[PDB]
Amino acid sequence: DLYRQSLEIISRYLREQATGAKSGATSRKALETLRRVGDGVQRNHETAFQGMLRKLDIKNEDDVKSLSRVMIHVFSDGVTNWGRIVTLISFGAFVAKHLKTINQESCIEPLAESITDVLVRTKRDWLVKQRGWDGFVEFFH
């Protein structure tokens, strides 16, 4: 399933980003790709992400769910490309790091489920057309 596969990759990435500690072939290769591209993306948007995180004040699970409802509407507006999808997942990694920092580690998995919901609920057909995670891997390399 698209949702299950997406969640496996996204949860693994957010958790390893937060703790600093690390279809299996596709999932493995997508995670590796995401480690490489997500790194440049997080650094490129660092100040912006910090600013957004500040205003949002995400400190518990309810806040995570609250933010996801708004993200769904924003992400569904405008163009769709892999770079924007990586940007969404990178913001998720950024938030995940913040949650670990403030000792709210229990919120990381719900955040991963919310980021995956944002992605799959709004871009399911685009993802299927682009060949899912295999498409992702092929696109970057």
Ligand SMILES: CCCc1ccc(-c2ccc(O)c(C(=O)O)c2)cc1
């Ligand atoms: C009140 C603001 C809540 C909010 C915060 C962040 C986002 C966000 C993050 C990364 C993204 O890549 C995109 C996007 O691509 O649209 C959108 C959307 C809404």
